[PDB]
Amino acid sequence: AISIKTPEDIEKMRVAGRLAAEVLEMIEPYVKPGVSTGELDRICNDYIVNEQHAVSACLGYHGYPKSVCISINEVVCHGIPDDAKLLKDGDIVNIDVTVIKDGFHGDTSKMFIVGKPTIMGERLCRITQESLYLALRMVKPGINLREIGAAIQKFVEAEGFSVVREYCGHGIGRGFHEEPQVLHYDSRETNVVLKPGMTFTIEPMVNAGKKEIRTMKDGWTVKTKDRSLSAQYEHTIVVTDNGCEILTLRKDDTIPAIISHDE
Ligand SMILES: [Co+2]
Ligand SMILES: [Co+2]
């Protein structure tokens, strides 16, 4: 069931979008060498809850134990903040945040580099981000959701990299994961012509090598099959009459918040 958000809904989202972005803006300083994914997890929850007056949708979601996800290096997804995993150097972590305020979610994620980059590190990240912005621009009404995934795909492989098919982006709003499914790859299955008011996520997961993954014992931690690196960046967006509106834009984003295709 694809939901077309009301204007008000939209105002709500803008809010969740921002709070969510804020948590990532807030944590920036704390992300340094010698940190516990666990602690990081504490600081966020306090913030989301204390200061923010909001809740985290990750918590208990399908039994998820933590408040947010934190995926180090070759961990792909759902990495679980342990009070004992500490931050190296050349560590490239993703923190995926997802927050609920007034019924609506704001879902976003980004990569952080630790205590002096790797090269391969910085490359991937950089590329992952571009592949995301890249889709960001395509977003406009009347476009098939399908040329978007292909696009990311093209870009990414072209760097000798691989796109992950197991996971994908999703509609979002009052429901954490709504319709549709947003695939970061080409597929005949795909066939959605976008409309204003539809809201959803772009969350490309990019491995430096091969598109194959493994799931751990703990039932969450997803790592590369290869043990290659993997990056992801994500944003929550709304389709406008002429392009899109990023509801999770942060200060460090090098893309406008409003993307218009008119004139
Ligand atoms: Co997310
Ligand atoms: Co998401």
**Distances, alpha carbon 185 to alpha carbons 164, 178, 189, 259, in Å:** 8, 19, 11, 23
The contacts of residue 160 (CB under 8 Å, 6+ apart) are none
Residue 93: CB atoms within 10 A of its CB come to: 23
182 neighbors 205 (Cβ within 8 angstroms): no
For ligand 1, the distance from its centroid to the CA atom of residue 16, given in whole angstroms, is 13
Spatial distance between the Cα atoms of 108 and 209, rounded to a whole number of angstroms: 24
Question: What's the reported resolution, in angstroms, to a tenth?
Answer: 2.4
Sheet strands (E) in 68-185:
69-72, 75-77, 92-101, 104-113, 162-163, 169-171, 178-182
DSSP state letters, 156-181: HHTTT-EE--S--EEE-SSSSSEEEE
What is the residue type of 24?
A: L
Tell how far the Cα of 107 is from the centroid of ligand 2, in angstroms: 5
Neighbours of 172 (CB within 10 A): 26
Cβ-proximal residues to 63 (8 Å cutoff; 6+ apart), any chain: none
Give CA–CA dist 258/263, Å, rounded. Answer: 14
Q: At 188, is the secondary structure helix, strand, or coil? A: coil
CATH number for the domain that contains residue 15? 3.90.230.10
DSSP β-bridge partners for residue 178: 171
Ligand 1 center to residue 254 CA distance, Å? 20
Structure tokens of 221? Answer: 């931690």
Q: Does the annotation flag 235 for ligand binding?
A: no
| Nearest ligand for residue 181 CA | 2
Task: Give the DSSP H/E element, type plus range, for residue 200.
Answer: strand 199-202
From the CA of 169, how far away is ligand 2's center (Å)? 6
**How far does the chain reach from its first CA to its final CA, in angstroms?**
33
Distance CA 84, CA 35 (A): 9
Q: What span, in angstroms and rounded, lies between the C-alpha atoms of 79 and 216?
A: 10
What tokens appear for 25 in the block? 């803006």
Q: What is the 3-state secondary structure (H, E, C) of 207-260?
A: ECCCCCEEECCCCCCEEECCCCCEEECEEEEEECCCEEEECCCCCCCCCCCEEE
- Per DSSP bridges, beta strands 104-113 and 92-101 are antiparallel
Asked, as a colleague might, if the bond just before 29 is cis with ω within 30 of 0, I would say no
* Domain range enclosing 67: 1-263
| Number of folded domains that form the chain | 1
Nearest to 26 by CA among 52, 59, 56: 52
Based on DSSP, count helices (H) and strands (E) in the chain, helices before strands.
4, 16
Tokens of 117: 């980059």
Main-chain dihedrals φ then ψ at residue 14, nearest 5 degrees: -50, -35
Q: Which amino acid is at 44?
A: C
For residue 110, which amino acid is it? K
